[PDB]
Amino acid sequence: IENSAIALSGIVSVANNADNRLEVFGVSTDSAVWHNWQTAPLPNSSWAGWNKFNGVVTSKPAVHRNSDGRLEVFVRGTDNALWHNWQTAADTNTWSSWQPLYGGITSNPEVCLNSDGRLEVFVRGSDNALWHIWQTAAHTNSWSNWKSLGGTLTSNPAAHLNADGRIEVFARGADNALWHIWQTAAHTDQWSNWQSLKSVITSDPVVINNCDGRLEVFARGADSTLRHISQIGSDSVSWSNWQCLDGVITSAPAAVKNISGQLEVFARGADNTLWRTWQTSHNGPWSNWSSFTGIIASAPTVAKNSDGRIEVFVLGLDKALWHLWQTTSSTTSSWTTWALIGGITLIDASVILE
Amino acid sequence: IENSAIALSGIVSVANNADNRLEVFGVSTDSAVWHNWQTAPLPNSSWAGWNKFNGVVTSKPAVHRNSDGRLEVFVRGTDNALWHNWQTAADTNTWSSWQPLYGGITSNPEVCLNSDGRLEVFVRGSDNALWHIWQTAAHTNSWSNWKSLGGTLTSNPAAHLNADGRIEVFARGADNALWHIWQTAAHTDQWSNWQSLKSVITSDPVVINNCDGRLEVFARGADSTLRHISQIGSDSVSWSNWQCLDGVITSAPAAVKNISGQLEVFARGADNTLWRTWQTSHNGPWSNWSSFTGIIASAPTVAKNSDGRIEVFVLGLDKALWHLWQTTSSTTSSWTTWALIGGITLIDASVILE
Amino acid sequence: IENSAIALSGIVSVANNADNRLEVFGVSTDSAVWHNWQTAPLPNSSWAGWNKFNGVVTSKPAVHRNSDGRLEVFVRGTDNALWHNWQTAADTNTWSSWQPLYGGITSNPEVCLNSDGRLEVFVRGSDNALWHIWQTAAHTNSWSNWKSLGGTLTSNPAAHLNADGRIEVFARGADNALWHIWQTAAHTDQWSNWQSLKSVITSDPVVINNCDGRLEVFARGADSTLRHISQIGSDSVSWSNWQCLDGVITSAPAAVKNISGQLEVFARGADNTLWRTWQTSHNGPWSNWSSFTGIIASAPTVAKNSDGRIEVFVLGLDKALWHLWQTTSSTTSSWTTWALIGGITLIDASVILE
Amino acid sequence: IENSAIALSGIVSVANNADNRLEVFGVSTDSAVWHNWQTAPLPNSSWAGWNKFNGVVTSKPAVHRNSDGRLEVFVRGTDNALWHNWQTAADTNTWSSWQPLYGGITSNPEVCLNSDGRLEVFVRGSDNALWHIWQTAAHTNSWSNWKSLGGTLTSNPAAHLNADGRIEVFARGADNALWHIWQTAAHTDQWSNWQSLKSVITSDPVVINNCDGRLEVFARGADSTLRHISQIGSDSVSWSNWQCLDGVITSAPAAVKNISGQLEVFARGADNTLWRTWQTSHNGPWSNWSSFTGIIASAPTVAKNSDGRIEVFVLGLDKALWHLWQTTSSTTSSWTTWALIGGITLIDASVILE
């Protein structure tokens, strides 16, 4: 792989509804977003079946739950602008049409919830800088003007809240290194400058918070293995050294914090099957990768059910969506084998960043 | 103190709105619930001023945020039944009138959110058993019938979600020991029998979840000191031994999990000032109690702001509400001194359980 | 129990030889010290049988391994002075006679090894102060003069090295509180003043080091339950709050750090059987006490074998020594039932401090 | 670097005496072992000056403290056999002549102390297998016959005790991977088969025990960065995945467990200066490498003083020994700059394994 490669992404975006039912969003062969959902937040739930949103789109969709429980989806349109739609009531299948947010965008959109309940969206813009736009009142359709955060991006952005409520954004730069930028006061328009975390990454960055409030970042490296880095925490502005984990991976990674407070990462492996690794104790070392049966055609997208069971979605070789999950809440739970969520096929609509 | 004492309670119930603004609920000299709130989730926010809900009540009010962001308050009425009111839209001061849930209740109400978005309320009933009633659809005014969980209670109930989504309820029994009962499957009407955690407690029990998903319970003991116990976790049905902490306390305790993932407890001390103790490292031993200046006339009620700053409310010697808070997000932050939230005086409306 | 009670002590002192074989020292009905030992450091080792040291003694004996591997025993004599004897070669049954160290002593002796290889002995003296005497060259019979550390003691002293090589000594004071005093530079004659850790204790204090270098102290409290306190560590001069553990105990406690780095404490319980409690995770909460079958007539004395198996010695109702042990090295090992180390009976020679 | 490279080794072997004074052993331009030592275990100690052992040698020397405190040194002779010498009394400069242990050896010797006080030495033999010989009685000159443990080695062996007293040996195999072999019962002649830990390493392996009893292994990898792996512990036979740490290193690493229970590693860096990294919390992530001033000409050899201060020895550009150290016991201590231990120059006598 080249230093400038971006590993194969997830084929859906997933959210929990207000009632915690899982719901997935992908793009079909008609270049439209479709969605499907659990009918009940139970281990044996049926799924509703695929439902279409009319309108042609030109990126992967990003979904987030508002602070009033309503799901809202962001996508690039045929005009290269940002568009969004939403549930008009939490847990209900009454959606708005696609509505315009304008701008000129050149990445998939990334959405985060501020600590004061306002959604905020981050994209690469026409000048390759990071741009952003936000709700100006929590869970309301009153949006700011577009504003630039500068930089030169070569991946999609990834955003996460610090434990103190400050949004921090990670993105690969022109030197193929991981860069980041952050709010310097919680949920305020006061941002740092861009700083480098060095290294080279060959996927979009993925970020998660540990129990103790430290952000941890995962990405594929130049040698095609998973690597990770973390905030050293307490008063400090610093981060750890980077570490690689052995095992060649062939997609973006997806990270989750299990019921027990420990980190787990999923990725397509060198043999094109799903691999999983977990921290074996607190902060701990990481397990050898474990494989699930079956060749997969996207990165995993990982979610947690209402009862904390982990569930993983992928593109199959039939170009449909498949999933598997933990059968019980224990971190030692058994797993199911891949099952089909049939009715449509999906395409990878991700923006070709080059 | 007698084994059957119940330490002085908090004078308000507090919640975060959908936008994370703090809002408090107490009962004034007119025996009505009044509320007040931060106008913005900022460290220097003004407060709106006290607003009254018409109607005479006969318990402490309990508030919880619905899964759609709307606050909802529960209280006993003049008819000894349960009543409730709610924001009709998240973050807005448009409330319903008090509406009936019926029943016959003999404690303050305790409200919990299931892991599937449905509110559930626990009370002592006319027969001294634990009773419960719940939303049958998330964030909707469709409520179940009343149902009994048996037992014989001598404190108010305290409810908390396990990390796997099962509600567990703690209450003092007829032998003055801590008892508990739990959902055996997440957000389902399938409950355990009552089991004893032994000991004797002389306050309502207070419960919190640690980072690693273990519940921990705090209460005042027979010797008037704080004591605590925790789930041993992983696969186990067991709990730890009890431990006491030195230092005589003179109110119910209030527990909070700080930004760093560590536990802190607040309580009125032997000298009638606010005391605080914290875990000095992970799981760790506990700090000696630290005091804040000023005599206080209730237990503390503790909350966290949108940026993780801890804030504490108490009844003053003037019978008004006072508060203090961390000036910044660090666990080493300085604290303010008590400041008045003036405009009304409060009474302790707690149900006299004897 | 009275605040000034001192719980029943262990009936033997135990050490590991240079080869790690266990060896025990007690006083028989002839008021002489006798000893016995494992013939091999193996789980099924035979014991040599009881061997007598000629000479009448008037305290419990204290043993320590020199920095050259030779065991050395300290005891009060018929003249109320300190006496000592030693192996003349490591792992060999060629002992010196009792030889004089003089002084006037009014407690059992306590021996510690400095971090520079010199033995040091702490006693209560004729004026009730703490006194000490030491080897002036490692593992040599060149001893200092006696020197006073002041104070007013009401228990035997207990000494332990800090992780940085400074000896620290714990003893109950005239107010029945735990006091302590320490070297302010490693293995140097530069000591702090006495400081109080407050509380009241009703046993000799017992001290151990945790993995992370923090000392932890265990003692029975005024309410006859185990209590404990620890250094908060890093740069700090401070200690934690005290915690009690439920369960009435009826002897001194004995603490051990298992193979896994976790603390375990043993004590005679309220029913006069051996009880055990362990930290269930790192720093963690403590397990409920677990009992072994059989009424015992002393506190436990606890040791670890060459392979880390824990072994516990007690006085039986026949007035002989009994022991039990872990059958394998795991912290989940099964335990044997009490077995007799027959051939003599023992008396409790502890100095009656009142 | 090639997969079969073995990074530059330490220029001395170091031990603590019975009194904890540091003492170093190297080979000079006369192909003889010389040694030097602290005269007192103090932060400002003078060093005695270089003293020669007569006799020409043909490997790096290995030293270990016996269970009776006497230092003992192992080296290959001009006849390719193993030879050894020892202090005839702990802490004294009265040494034996070199005495024969015979055999045919083709690596540097590695010495370990069993948990029953017997020294054991591991070498590569004439057939490239691992061979061993041991004291048959603790701290005695009664040695076993030579015995083979098989395998095919391409590095020097590294031995360490498990927490349960079982010796485990690590060595690079014919495939350049890390292999290991272990006692299956403590201090017994009952060994496992060889098993692979996979990976490729380009230095001798270095092993240390964590607080919690898990062995951790450090080595340079194929990409010239530090990598490490650990036992997953409790009941398990398994190890973690390998992790690399960023930063190109140019010598063997040296690992130490500080006062606080945390791991630190030292290595010559890409700029030929001494680099250091530490675990920033428990098990934690690792700090970015920190550099000390000055170009160095060997790997570091790391030791701890009687008071826990870390001290590091290296070969200078003048071909003499230099050292630096922590000025106080805190893990935040300042460090000195390199100072000369003058009087001789040293050569790297390591056996050329190819």
Ligand SMILES: C[C@@H]1O[C@@H](O)[C@@H](O)[C@H](O)[C@@H]1O
């Ligand atoms: C998502 C939107 O879909 C339709 O609504 C188009 O008219 C827009 O340009 C956009 O593609």
Ligand SMILES: C[C@@H]1O[C@@H](O)[C@@H](O)[C@H](O)[C@@H]1O
């Ligand atoms: C998202 C942003 O869209 C508009 O406001 C442009 O002027 C910017 O360059 C950026 O493309």
Ligand SMILES: C[C@@H]1O[C@@H](O)[C@@H](O)[C@H](O)[C@@H]1O
């Ligand atoms: C991910 C799925 O894996 C197996 O179940 C295959 O049979 C499917 O086509 C799909 O690739």
Ligand SMILES: C[C@@H]1O[C@@H](O)[C@@H](O)[C@H](O)[C@@H]1O
């Ligand atoms: C809270 C309610 O307040 C009024 O609405 C009364 O009519 C009810 O009995 C109840 O007290």
Ligand SMILES: C[C@@H]1O[C@@H](O)[C@@H](O)[C@H](O)[C@@H]1O
């Ligand atoms: C809350 C409950 O109220 C009614 O349904 C009563 O019949 C019960 O006894 C209990 O008091």
Ligand SMILES: C[C@@H]1O[C@@H](O)[C@@H](O)[C@H](O)[C@@H]1O
């Ligand atoms: C809690 C407050 O503490 C001090 O500030 C007093 O002056 C007030 O009356 C009040 O008791």
Ligand SMILES: C[C@@H]1O[C@@H](O)[C@@H](O)[C@H](O)[C@@H]1O
């Ligand atoms: C331990 C010693 O035993 C004998 O050697 C006596 O003569 C001494 O006074 C002392 O009791």
Ligand SMILES: C[C@@H]1O[C@@H](O)[C@@H](O)[C@H](O)[C@@H]1O
């Ligand atoms: C151990 C000490 O013995 C002597 O040196 C006495 O003068 C002291 O009072 C103390 O008793």
Ligand SMILES: C[C@@H]1O[C@@H](O)[C@@H](O)[C@H](O)[C@@H]1O
């Ligand atoms: C400690 C031992 O416990 C039981 O085994 C009794 O039969 C013995 O007499 C002794 O008390």
Ligand SMILES: C[C@@H]1O[C@@H](O)[C@@H](O)[C@H](O)[C@@H]1O
């Ligand atoms: C270390 C030994 O040194 C001398 O004693 C030689 O005679 C031996 O062959 C060996 O080299």
Ligand SMILES: C[C@@H]1O[C@@H](O)[C@@H](O)[C@H](O)[C@@H]1O
């Ligand atoms: C150390 C060993 O030395 C002898 O006993 C040889 O026969 C072996 O091959 C090995 O070299």
Ligand SMILES: C[C@@H]1O[C@@H](O)[C@@H](O)[C@H](O)[C@@H]1O
């Ligand atoms: C390790 C030492 O580093 C510097 O102090 C140089 O001046 C020396 O020659 C030596 O290389």
